[PDB]
Structures are given as C-alpha cells and as structure tokens.
C-alpha cells in the first residue's frame, strides 16, 4: 500500500534529524568551507538512501559509516585539482603606412589585394600575377619611404 512509500520518507527524515547536522561539521572541519560541506552532506545522504544495506541493522552505527563516505568524497575532490591589453600604437602606425601605400596603387590591384578568382571574373594566373606585381609595388613603395 501507500503507507510504505511514506515509510521510506519517514525513515530518511528520521536519520537526517540525527546525523546531517553532525556530518556537516565533519566535512566542515575537513574543508574549512561550509558551502562544500553543505554539498557533501546531501551527496552522502543520497548515497545512504541509495544503500539501504547499512541502516537496516539499526543496532549498528550508521554515523560511523557516513563519516567515511564524506571523508572519501572530499579527497576525491582533492585529487590533482590543483592581464591588461597593450596599446595599439605600432599596429596602427603600420596600417597608417600601409594605407598610405594603398593610394599609390591602381584600382584593379587594389580591388584584388583587398580580398578569389571566382568573383572578379579573371584567371588564376591573372590573380597570381596581379597579386605578385601589386605586392612588389607595395614593397617598393614601403621601402621607398624607408620601412
């Protein structure tokens, strides 16, 4: 009947009231952190509910079984679990030159370098070349200025 599915609850709530507030302190001293201890306690008691082969023999210490569960979980966590952006001066000066050696170009070399042989409707050799000569013009201009 349903009284049994309620007996499960009334069995847990009857061990909580006697052992959770004490298990908490154990994990607290071992972690110095009441938040984790709060977590570890629920983890442990869930396992307890999941392992009824321990509480059945009421006459045997359950608390003693619980302490070891927690003590193990903490160390499981203690396994191998153990700025400012530069100033854009250079890059910007570099581009300020690159942009000054872009006006020294022809609109076709420009439209090509700003990107490919599928759009501009020309060969791949025309690409390779226009790229090639355009670069060399860029290199020439830059080194003309003394880069």
């Amino acid at each position: 009947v349903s009284g049994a599915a309620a007996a499960e609850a009334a069995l847990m709530r009857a061990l909580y009231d006697e052992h959770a507030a004490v298990l908490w302190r154990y994990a607290l001293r071992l972690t110095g952190d009441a938040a984790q201890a709060e977590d570890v306690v629920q983890e442990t008691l869930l396992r307890a509910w999941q392992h009824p082969e321990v509480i059945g023999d009421t006459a045997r210490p359950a608390r003693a079984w619980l302490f070891t569960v927690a003590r193990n979980m903490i160390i499981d966590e203690r396994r191998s679990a153990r700025q400012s952006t530069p100033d854009e001066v250079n890059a910007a000066l570099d581009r300020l030159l690159i942009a000054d050696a872009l006006a020294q170009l022809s609109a076709e070399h420009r439209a090509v370098i700003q990107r490919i042989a599928t759009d501009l409707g020309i060969a791949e050799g025309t690409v390779k070349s226009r790229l090639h000569y355009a670069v060399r013009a860029l290199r020439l201009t830059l080194q003309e200025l003394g880069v």
Binding site: E8, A9, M12, R13, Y16, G32, D33, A34, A35, E38, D39, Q42, E43, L45, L46, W49
Partner: protein, 97 residues
C-alpha cells in the same frame, strides 16, 4: 559562485530523475536558493559564502557598490592617457600664466 550554483542545479536534476525522498529534494532546492542568492548578492542574507581564508566572496552586486564599484570607480572617474605627475617646485621668475 556560478560553479557552485551549477553543481547544485545538476544535482537537483539528478534527484528529480531518481525520485529521491521528498526531504532531499526540498532540502536541495533550499541550497539552490541560497546559492543563487549568493550569486546575486552574497552576504545579503545570513552569513556570507566564505572563500579560502574565511574571506567573503564578491558577488555581482558587490561589483557596483561603494568606491570600488563600477559606478564610482570606472564611470564617474576614469584614468586618462596623455597625463603625468611629478614633484612641484616654486618658480618665482615664472609669470602667472
């Protein structure tokens, strides 16, 4: 803070799926509540969430309060380029301007 909240939320999903006792599910929802409360304004209710060294952790609302908050520290007064500082010395020969 976010990580603790996520841990408790995933545990809540586990408990709901596993049909854990109502006591555990409710006592876990309470902890999720407290953890989200800490995420938004740690220390507002009860004892603050202590970090390593019994140090209260900063929350999202702590990012905006007081002199170190965003408003007073990073909005009302910024730090500026093109500036310097040095010791002052009297210059009698100088003009007022």
């Amino acid at each position: 803070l976010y990580r603790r909240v996520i841990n408790r939320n995933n545990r809540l999903k586990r408990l709901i799926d596993l049909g854990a006792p109502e006591i555990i599910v409710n006592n876990e929802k309470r902890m999720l509540q407290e953890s989200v409360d800490a995420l938004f304004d740690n220390g507002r209710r009860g004892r603050p969430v202590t970090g390593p060294g019994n140090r209260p952790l900063k929350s999202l609302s702590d990012l905006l309060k007081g002199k170190q908050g965003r408003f007073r520290q990073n909005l009302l007064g910024k730090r500026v380029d093109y500036s310097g500082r040095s010791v002052i010395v009297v210059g009698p020969q100088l003009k007022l301007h």
